[PDB]
Symmetry: C3
Amino acid sequence: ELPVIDAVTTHAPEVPPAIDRDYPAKVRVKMETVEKTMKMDDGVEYRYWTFDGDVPGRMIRVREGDTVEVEFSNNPSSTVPHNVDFHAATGQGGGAAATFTAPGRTSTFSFKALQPGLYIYHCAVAPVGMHIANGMYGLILVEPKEGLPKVDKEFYIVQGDFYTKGKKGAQGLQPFDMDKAVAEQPEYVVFNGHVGALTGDNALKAKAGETVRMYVGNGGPNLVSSFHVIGEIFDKVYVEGGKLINENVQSTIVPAGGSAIVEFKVDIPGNYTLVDHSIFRAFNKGALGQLKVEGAENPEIM
Amino acid sequence: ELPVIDAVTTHAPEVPPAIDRDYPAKVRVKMETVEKTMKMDDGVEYRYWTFDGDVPGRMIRVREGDTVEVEFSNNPSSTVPHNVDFHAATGQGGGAAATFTAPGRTSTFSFKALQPGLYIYHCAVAPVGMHIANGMYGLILVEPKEGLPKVDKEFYIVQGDFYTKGKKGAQGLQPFDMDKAVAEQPEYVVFNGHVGALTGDNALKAKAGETVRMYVGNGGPNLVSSFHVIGEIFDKVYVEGGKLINENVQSTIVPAGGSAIVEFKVDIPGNYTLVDHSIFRAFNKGALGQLKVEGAENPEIM
Amino acid sequence: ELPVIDAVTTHAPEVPPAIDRDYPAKVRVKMETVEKTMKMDDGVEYRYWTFDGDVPGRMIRVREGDTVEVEFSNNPSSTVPHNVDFHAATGQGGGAAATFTAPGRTSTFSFKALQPGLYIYHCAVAPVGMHIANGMYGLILVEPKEGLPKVDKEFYIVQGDFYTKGKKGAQGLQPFDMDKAVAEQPEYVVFNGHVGALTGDNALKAKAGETVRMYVGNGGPNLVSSFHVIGEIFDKVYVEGGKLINENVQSTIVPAGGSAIVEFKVDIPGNYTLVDHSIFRAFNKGALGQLKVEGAENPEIM
Ligand SMILES: O=N[O-]
Ligand SMILES: O=N[O-]
Ligand SMILES: O=N[O-]
Ligand SMILES: [Cu+2]
Ligand SMILES: [Cu+2]
Ligand SMILES: [Cu+2]
Ligand SMILES: [Cu+2]
Ligand SMILES: [Cu+2]
Ligand SMILES: [Cu+2]
């Protein structure tokens, strides 16, 4: 019989603590879907559909071999059903059927995390593209039995493309636009659901000399990210989120409904900006994040 | 001179028998190009230009070092010249010049399969994009001298984007639309030339516990696939169809005019759906396939 | 202190000589930004913004551990300031802040090439996407300490998407078009700044039997290249320009703001054309280059 443990999940930029256990366990996770109106950009509002109050949903972290027990609830105020498809899960719809939950209801189901990796999870209620485009996606990290190398700083980042009826900048509550979605012409492309969610006062933080690891997901719906950090180079890249590691990469592809893990040492102070290098998305649509590094200057590097 | 062997090619979902020989051979392949009107979707017809009657063309399977002798016939009823560019072939146009065949003629030529891999082959008659967009592509698997591991189930899948003058859903015979193709705005994105070609009654089949390997090609012309199988995880991925193997990947990029090889064990019964995870293509344009798995339920997994 | 060496930088198709030194050095590089009108296609002119007179800029080649000193000059006739972000550099904007140069001014700065790889460098003056779209980008190769394997032929290739107000073919001077850029709908997609820059009389050259290496960049701004050479197969691919080597690949993804290194032996005469296999870009938008190989025929290969 398997041990029962409550999972530690985090709201985004934050990542749960590393797992210090060398045996399988039943990990209980609680998730709620809530529809709410939030700021997309200055003077722009959007009706997001979320996993636990924001975009992306809370990061889940378990160990290879663990059984993940999910208590899935859909808030009474929701207008449509919601569920969840874990790319980390093996079986019918990644758990979608088992978690189909009408508003004001609760569903429970479990699945075994048979393989390590960094997996996207997202709502799969029809129409699928709309539920995803409204913000229903997050990440679940399944650590290898032996764990991952220790690192000084960890960040949870998820890129998504959004389709607004009005063009980028149009004030007020902007409705989801089906036509632009099908045509794959988003108005906003962002990290963690909103323009500036990880920039300015919300910038990520690290200290010079610290090793950094970013768990980068791409919830889509449609765009593929040419992920890059201005002023830095990826020492390591877990290609497409898998076991294969590449090194000295400037820009990595993060598939739609996919992920990547990148690591780099920030040996010099300054502001590093995360971007989808399909450039106009970054400087015109909002795909821009910042990692502010405090510390002391080294002219030998620059 | 080498031992002669008549190639066994398969119409799509099916893959030819694995190669169990450790010596080079002259493999005789016969291909015919035929233009025909077929159903793209319910009430929607399209004039396809095909390699052997459907999209994709018949899968070819040879061994690294083999000499592939192609007898290329262009059906008498064709209205334009056709040829073939084998990405597996080294030399002028991948064989296109040597296989330029007018309607009612048969061209013969040969090429040595110098390197193992999973290669796209397609027509290259001007205008190249049009011949490809009308459905002229397939895959040729060149096995390594040592062969490939035995697997229980092998499937032949090729994604393609189609450009219809009318919008998706418009009834009747829909002509090829050059303007949409250049702008890279397809109306249909499908697996194996037709909406549902691999779904419903045409779903792929396997039994719980079987090892599965999918040879995934992307004939384009333009889209790049974020290939994924809902409810499953790729144990192995031959990155971009080459020698490099990744593991535990949820979604892999299949380059336009490229491929990928993914493997996974289907340990639990259910319906698994193949999709391009640039999501709207899958649930709005037709990039959706199904693998039905019969067998007995394991709750420990889900 | 470090020996000072004037760098050899090459205008594109050409690559600087391999680095034959096993000790670090201070490599002096001179770069000038100049805005000039040039031919994009027959009867079509475009106002390019360039690093040293053309697109891409001159290729820089240094050794891991080298200190790169840059003397950056913005020509008096320029209408806006320019600078440079080296993806090879670690620190604030890859050197963008330190190289912000007004017209008629000169700036100097230096950085240590801490990691080997093939890096894109580009202007980063707001609006960033426009400075890149007008042609401001190039490559800097940072060799590994031990160097790279000897190869018979080396080529400098950089893809880029351009956005013109008029559609492809419209005669006269065509201004940059922001709306098409944001929507990611280029009119021209080319290798080395102009349609035909590497084709016809400008084709690359090699002899049968020679080993070839192409340093492939993708300055974007927005597209991702499914890079392929018709009639050839990539023996080796430095995945996304990093350390990881794939083999037997027909087509590789070159990320926006990213690169790749491909190698192949041209064992038979003929014309091999480089293309972005998102096919219409190649045959309709200009993403087409040629490598003409002289020598004698080998029927055994084809
Ligand atoms: O170097 N990033 O635009
Ligand atoms: O998990 N596929 O939508
Ligand atoms: O194989 N070139 O389209
Ligand atoms: Cu939902
Ligand atoms: Cu999914
Ligand atoms: Cu044809
Ligand atoms: Cu091709
Ligand atoms: Cu500039
Ligand atoms: Cu950049």
